[PDB]
């Protein structure tokens, strides 16, 4: 009946040096720990202390290649920072992404290893930069590894090549590094949520739609339930987890749960457009958490309205330590779309998981 917390100041130290109010704020972190202790979430904690990510622990899921560019990217100096930069897709580095890259993996592989060997129960980690952007062989918007993939290899690493992980991908962009990661992979379930927009939603590509299933042994194991004209929030929300999410996930019956948990589908978020109010983010938790026994990660990916984020990811390690779900308010009828999209990710997953016929 323990949940861990894992936090570490270090992680403020990647910064933009041309933009310094760039959404992807070192306080973001700060801000999320310091609510937890306004509320007394804190000391109901237990803490787990951050690490750095190895360069074989990296290997898991990232090229040499890759490694060797990001990390060299500490020596480099601002007019080689900039430039690097400027080669991918939304991304800025300072002298300190690096290390702070590696440290938000680590974090994550120590809370893992805390639940596996049955430290906690479950656990969430304040970490940036993000993962869920980043591929095998690039950064990628904000995002330099694949912090939630990494941590999934990582957890078969210590207990069994097969172990079966889930990543619930809630932040309202597509995980387009996670999907690629495991596109070919039945024992690492992928299922996200996200704003599509027929493509024309950051990133930007049908990859995220609802017609990827995955490919080779993965095929049924990659869920894209993508959002189309409507701002989207609890209803949508909620649906989607009881017709979707929730009755494959059962199926799938994980041993570990990781949570992509960005919160830039919050209401407030300036880049979002959605609505998902902090309760809301409270009942997904709290149904994720009939998982795995109960053994569930959350891992902070993006959101940038910092009193949102902050108020959203509390309510989640709440409920992660057995508060009973506030109350969610009366629950609109679901935009039509949206019932359109969860139709259209029913058709495409039959084939796949008995519990969705
Ligand atoms: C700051 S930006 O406007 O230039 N942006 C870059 C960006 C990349 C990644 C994330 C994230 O949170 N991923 O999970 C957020 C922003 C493009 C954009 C435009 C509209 C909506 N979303 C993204
Ligand atoms: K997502
Ligand atoms: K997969
Ligand atoms: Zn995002």
């Not at 999934?152 to 690493?157: E, G, K, L, M, P």
């Not at 701002?231 to 994980?254: N, S």
Request: hydrophobic share 40%.
């Amino acid at each position: 009946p323990i949940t861990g917390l894992v936090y570490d100041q270090r992680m403020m130290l990647h910064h933009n040096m041309w933009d310094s109010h760039h959404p992807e704020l070192p306080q973001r972190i700060s801000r999320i720990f310091s609510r937890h202790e306004e509320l007394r979430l804190l000391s109901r904690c237990h803490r787990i202390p951050a690490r750095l990510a190895t360069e074989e622990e990296l290997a898991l899921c990232h090229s040499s290649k890759h490694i060797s560019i990001i990390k060299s990217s500490e020596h480099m100096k601002p007019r080689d920072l900039n430039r690097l930069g400027d080669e991918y897709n939304s991304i800025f580095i300072s002298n300190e992404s690096y290390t702070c890259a590696l440290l938000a993996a680590g974090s994550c592989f120590n809370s893992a290893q805390a639940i596996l060997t049955g430290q906690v129960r479950n656990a969430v980690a304040i970490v940036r930069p993000p993962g869920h952007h980043a591929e095998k062989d690039t950064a990628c918007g904000f995002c330099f590894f694949n912090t939630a993939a990494l941590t999934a290899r990582y957890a078969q690493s210590i207990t069994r090549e097969s172990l079966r992980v889930l990543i619930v991908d809630w932040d309202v962009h597509h995980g387009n590094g996670t999907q690629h990661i495991f596109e070919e992979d039945d024992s690492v379930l992928y299922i996200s949520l996200h704003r599509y927009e027929d493509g024309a939603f950051f990133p930007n590509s049908e990859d995220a739609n609802y017609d990827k299933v995955g490919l080779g042994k993965g095929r049924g194991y990659n869920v894209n339930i993508p959002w189309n004209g409507g701002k989207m929030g609890d209803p949508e929300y909620m649906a989607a987890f009881h017709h979707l999410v929730m009755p494959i996930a059962r199926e799938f019956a994980p041993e570990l749960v990781l949570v992509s948990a960005g919160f830039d589908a919050a209401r407030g978020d300036p880049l979002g457009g959605f609505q998902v109010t902090p309760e809301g983010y409270a009942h997904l938790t709290h149904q994720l958490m009939s998982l795995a026994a109960g053994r569930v990660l959350i891992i902070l990916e993006g959101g940038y309205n910092l009193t949102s984020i902050s108020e959203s990811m509390s309510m989640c390690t709440s409920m992660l330590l057995g508060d009973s779900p506030p109350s969610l308010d009366h629950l609109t009828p679901l935009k039509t779309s949206a019932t359109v999209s969860i139709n259209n990710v029913l058709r495409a997953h039959a084939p796949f998981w008995s519990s969705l016929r």
